[PDB]
Point group: D2
Chain length 475, copies 4
């Protein structure tokens, strides 16, 4: 198997404490390896090292740092098959979108380097403001914050790790990197390649273990200058609460509404709804989790959707199944408990209320109501609920009633109204006539309300991991 | 003389609690007037009244929003006499400087407005990124965050209040506004204008009360979408820790250093320091608070500075004096304790240690050590410590040893070295051959470490009051 | 009362040295409105030099001072919108409220121009951003005025298209030699009377007058000129580009904007917009709907709608705000007729108009117009609107792009995604979806391709055309 | 040996005229190869072929365009050993620096493509200007100009070709390309890789022939939508005079001044000046070509300069000598004329005025005056004058009196002072304590006055080969 070490100041080490955590494959239950469970003291060592490595790192010329991201991305790509195999086993992701995770990461890395390389400064004259003297000029550059705490979830163990690391590193920051436990092995092998690519000692520090044990020690630590975090809303809110006096970026849970209207292409609506709701078996923060369909077209759409839900494969990740088993029992019983509240309240089961351990069949539900839990709570599994609506006004109200606000879809041939409906939605991104999604990666990515704080995507990521530095000359 | 009311939902009202708070002048102690003290009922009412008004405000044409700002600024200019003078009685700020405060704010508002109109969107095609879609276009725009809590200090009652309010309203947030209790009667009048200019009902809510009593409910209230604060560093800490899941902008204290080399113009350098440290009796966040002078010129710099300080006038704001009374007797006492510790630890008194009540003679202190408290602690009073240093490297070290990092000044004829030093300083803004200042307001403004959180200025305040709003379309590919 | 105008040079209000003048009349009345000096080749020379000498002292002025000049020039304009207003009404035969409306628009343009220059910012770049580059090098990129700007405006908007070129020139630190149209010099001068009184320094703004045919080529070829901005006919614009040398030339010329009308279009709006767009200021506008392409399917009820609205347009005098007022002159009217008379003879359907009493042409609608007819291509600059019936959008695009012009276009259809896609195939500056064509709002970039123009306009793009990159490289 | 065919519509052809032009290696006067002298009609086919192809090419998704540039650069890199050799023999460019030219070309192309990938549009809203409707929205993208005419010189037969071609194509223009006759073989090979990269038919056309013969027709052809030119000032002015209604960008000659002041670090200065002046034996548009030195430190600078100068290697391009034979005999004689004029007027010869055919020694000249031709005329050869200057004002004034305004250098310890001296200088780019140069290639590059028109550099090229396309949507 894979009994892994962690990177601190350029060497691969274990816990001094000698203790590990076991990592199995969620689909088969089979042993993949282990990771060190690090103490708070080993977390102090990581943080202090990175701090000291940053002072040398910020000084490196900008092209030196981008050359590193480049060398790292090249390495990730030729390891796509292998890092790919690992991811799919570790977190049960279908083989192809798991190999495709590594490629995409490499792409995010280079594009991130490229965009760093053209952050320019700006000059301002004093007198561009009334009063302001004719003879002073402000030179405004961009400065790294210090040490970045980057915490990533299970569902994109490489992509969500690198998308935080890379904009932090290329802008002169150093990183302390905490992968989700399920996902650590893939995080580590990603960092393996960053160091074979010649990364300097201490610039990237990996901390592993008991996210419930070391979690706060990381988030509250004085050596941490900024935090990037992608995960659940609960853990998201605790970080926000327990970090202080530092920039903090959060991308959290979603309950992305799909508003389907009178005059939608129902074939395309159906294809896009399914594809968005059932990708990686519902286990995505950005995904359709809610459909609000006008009554007149409801039956048509619901049959259109049911037909595609029946098409979907369900089985092994090594097979490229559409539906694969969810992450653990915690999750699988939570999903099942959501279908439960729905059924015993009037919901019509249109398809697959089946459960084979962690393998949960693609569940489609009709006649869902405000009264039901599945209407509001992020399941993180392969269950989709359909709500029947009188008009767009009802669809917007129920959209905005969610505490979530990541992305929304509008399906309508009437493009003008679709844009004006979107303005009324309280989310980061609206998608007209298409499924919600984080990519392509150069597009800003954000949620609001309880879905997040801060803005990601290539260039917003770089912008948030730096601050303005001003030198005012007096000619 | 001024028993102010507060604006809730378009109406100038009192508290249902019946209770007021008297505000007397620090220059003497004569009573200027009073301010409502609101309960957790009237605050939640304001937040509700602000949250609901923003649904209509946010859908207004942006051009209508800016006009309210133009109309509000003009009204303030008309009233620079009556309102500028309220400031000088309230926070005891020199008359000319006070009227000048009201002047700068209108400019700030109009320039804020002007920038709002140039807030363009951006478009992105999907295949601008590897494997992305040629037939997708993101319409990226800005969107208001919602209800902004604007908290401001006694420092700049009007200036620093409207500096938060104007960018917030123009981008289509509504505002719940908490002035400093002292400085409230000043901010209130400032608002009277915004309401006179025609402000829609509820877009600007004015809350008033003891701050130590009602401030934590405000900070943690789930109806607030964004906090912007300028005040004491202690209270900043509170806010950052008690808020969560919202943007938070804090502007906090400073121990701004001046570094003076051998190859420096000792007249200009001296003049900049006395201008920047002793302005409004040093009761500014951005102010030269400690000088690191090379000892080869220490004798010469200290002399230059001793002279100009002696030329500063001591008295009442009505009389436009250079040195005015500090805010209250608490502050007065804390400053004296900073002098006494320095002097007990072997510092040199160069100019007036004297004080008359809350009026405190400007104090020059030489041969100050890292051992003395005044070398580190922000006095917020008319005291200036000179610390003799051997070179630039030792001056950086100590400068950087502070928990503060707002602004700095490096004085030298050699400009290449000053840029090279500046890069090594953990501050937001470096001033070559000039004092530190927040102005001009279109310059980015930020402190690092314990000095602040986030960025400001005209443009950067606007961005901080907003978020990306992306719309992604399909494009047709073939008709032909 | 007769306004006997003088022109301003080097801070002084002067006459011609020869004393000779050009009389200027009301086109809608016949009455003399005043006159203008007529200047020698050598008075042109005294203006230009006196502007080169001024510019060296004006570029040094801090930006806020230049901005405060624009702001005070705008204020007086607004304050004078009634007198300047009424004058334009007379001098170019334009409705009263759109005369005043021109002045207000102008004072808004100036003010938005002033605040936009106030926001031009420098850039810094490090050497190693490009591969191989040095990390020690830092470029400070700024913007330097070009020097002396020749601003030439037409009779269309004698104030607005004059200032659209002056205000962005002056505020960035250029000086201006301003050549207005003869018909319109009076108003153009009352505009500069206003810049005079705001406190403009000597030599900053030089007015030159005289017939373009006389003094024009001298002005255009003059080595003292650093940049030209021109608004007028396609003929003159072409000539200017041919004669100008070694300098940025920005031109906005004629247009034959199509309105493309697909079958699924809302037809009461489409007609409403086309009528407002074709017949405003009686068609004498570079940006105007000058030809309609409509699918056969809906061709009949559209043309019926258009015809209804044409018959409600008031015709006559500028003082009573007639929708249609008399064209610019008889030569102007005779060109229009020859275009109508060609269409009539070549087989076209007259639906309305062809009435006239001298200068005052009634609104004219032409159905069944073909590519065989001149009026399908040639800019009439008059109150006539041809309609060309078409099988589908592919033929409309084709026929749109066959024209020499490419200023603006309008696409009327309920299918927005398609209208965008169709627009991308139109060789024009700006495509308007479900709306008429127009130059503004003024912050929108405004330009023609092909024979419609060269270089970009609109508030900001104007600002950039009248400056150039200045670059200081430091070795840290 | 290299009998080049040219590229039309994806086929490799000789001329229909049947005529050819012999190209000889300037180091040895031996035959290298030949090129076709096209007719006016072959130039017309070329223009038409690219006009057609543009309509399909402008349509391609941005990423596809970008992708071709990349494949082209990887092939040029792969090919740097053979193209560099060909540049070396065609233009007598020191071996390594010719290869380096190809490496510089690949870097410029890749970066260009990357910059093109980052061109984003902007949305403007109606009421962003006073009066504007709240309910409409302008989408503003960049649209290609059409067919670009790219004219390149001899001394960067690839880098200065590609710097034009690369951003033309990527933003969706097509290119008609006139390389210098001397250097036409390098270009053809540069283009061979582009075709090998899979450039669709007609997006890149190569026209070879006498600029004296085919140049005028080409520059005046209405199929041409833009011209970009690097060469002499005399051709540049001719081009600008003759072209019309299209954008034109010129990079012309220069006489780059080095100002050396009292506090100058004279070691660094000497170094910077000899490196900047004598690269490619002075056969560069940007290069220090005159020195204004304060007479207080003059004798010392010239000594330092002399040591380095007498230390430059003189010989064949194959041997990587610093000083290589100049381009042709015409050149060698125009240079001889300038030395003679200076000596025959008093100047001090401090280092060689010695020849072997076109192989000239680096000549240094002291005691140069504003009366010698070499004070002013661009030598385009290994000759450097030094002028004794009282103070900075003399330095400034003497700099500006020149017709050229490309770049300048300021040497002094006082960096504030070097900035304000920079301000008062009428040039494109001022370099503090460093030589003049075009690079790094993302930096804005421009001449003013007789030195240029418009702007180059990576991103500014992209902007100069496109224009705004507006689409106004209506959400009400
Ligand atoms: O009026 P419109 O729409 O009909 O446009 P236009 O006749 O082409 O005239 C536009 C502007 O250019 C001037 N002009 C005429 N001929 C010129 C020339 N050869 N060179 C430079 N400027 C010239 C005109 O002055 P004039 O009014 O004297 O023609 C007018 O100011
Ligand atoms: O080479 P260089 O540095 O010495 O500078 P140059 O003589 O001005 O040549 C620069 C470029 O301009 C071309 N050219 C020559 N005559 C022309 C004309 N009449 N019209 C348009 N282009 C023309 C040249 O072609 P040729 O090299 O064939 O003259 C060459 O490609």
């Amino acid at each position: 198997q894979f009994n892994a070490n962690i990177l601190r100041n350029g060497e691969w080490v274990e816990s001094r404490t000698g203790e590990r955590i076991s990592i199995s494959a969620p689909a088969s239950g089979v042993a993949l390896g282990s990771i060190p469970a690090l103490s708070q003291e080993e977390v102090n060592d990581a943080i202090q090292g990175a701090k000291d490595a940053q002072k040398i790192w910020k000084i490196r010329p900008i092209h030196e740092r981008v050359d590193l991201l480049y060398a790292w991305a090249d390495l990730l790509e030729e390891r796509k098959e292998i890092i790919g195999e690992l991811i799919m086993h570790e977190v049960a992701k279908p083989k192809k979108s798991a190999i495709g995770e590594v490629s995409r990461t490499a792409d995010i890395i280079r594009h991130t380097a490229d965009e760093a390389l053209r952050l320019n400064g700006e000059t301002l004259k004093g007198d561009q403001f009334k009063g302001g003297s004719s003879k002073k000029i402000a030179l405004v550059e961009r400065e790294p914050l210090g040490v970045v705490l980057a915490i990533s979830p299970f569902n994109y163990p490489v992509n969500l790790a690198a998308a935080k690391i890379a904009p932090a590193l290329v802008t002169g920051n150093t990183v302390v990197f905490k992968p989700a436990t399920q996902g650590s092995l893939s995080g580590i092998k990603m960092v393996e390649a960053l160091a074979d690519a010649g990364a300097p000692e201490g610039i990237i520090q990996v901390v592993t273990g008991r996210g419930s044990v070391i979690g706060d020690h990381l988030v509250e630590h004085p050596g941490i200058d900024m935090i990037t975090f992608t995960g659940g809303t609960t853990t998201g809110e605790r970080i926000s609460e327990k970090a202080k006096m530092i920039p903090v970026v959060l991308e959290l849970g979603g309950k992305d509404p799909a508003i389907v209207l009178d005059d939608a292409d129902l074939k395309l609506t159906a294809s896009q709804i399914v594809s968005g709701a059932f990708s990686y078996s519902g286990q995505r923060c950005t995904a359709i989790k809610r459909v609000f369909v006008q009554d007149s077209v409801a039956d048509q759409l619901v049959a259109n959707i049911k037909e595609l839900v029946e098409q979907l494969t369900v089985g092994s990740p090594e097979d490229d199944a559409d539906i694969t088993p969810v992450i653990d029992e915690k999750s699988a019983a939570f999903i099942q408990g959501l279908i439960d509240d729905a059924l015993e309240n009037g919901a019509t089961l249109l398809s697959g209320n089946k459960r084979q351990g962690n393998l949960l069949s693609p569940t489609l539900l009709d006649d869902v109501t405000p009264a039901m839990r599945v209407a509001w709570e992020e399941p993180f599994g392969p269950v989709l609920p359909i709500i029947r609506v009188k008009d767009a006004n009802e669809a917007i109200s129920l959209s905005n009633q969610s505490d979530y606000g990541l992305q929304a879809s509008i399906f309508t041939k009437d493009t003008d109204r679709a844009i004006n409906i979107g303005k009324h939605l309280e989310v980061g991104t609206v998608h007209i006539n298409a499924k919600t999604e984080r990519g392509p990666d150069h597009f800003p990515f954000l949620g609001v309300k309880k879905s997040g704080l801060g803005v990601q995507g290539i260039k917003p990521s770089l912008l948030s991991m730096t601050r303005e530095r001003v030198t005012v000359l007096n000619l």
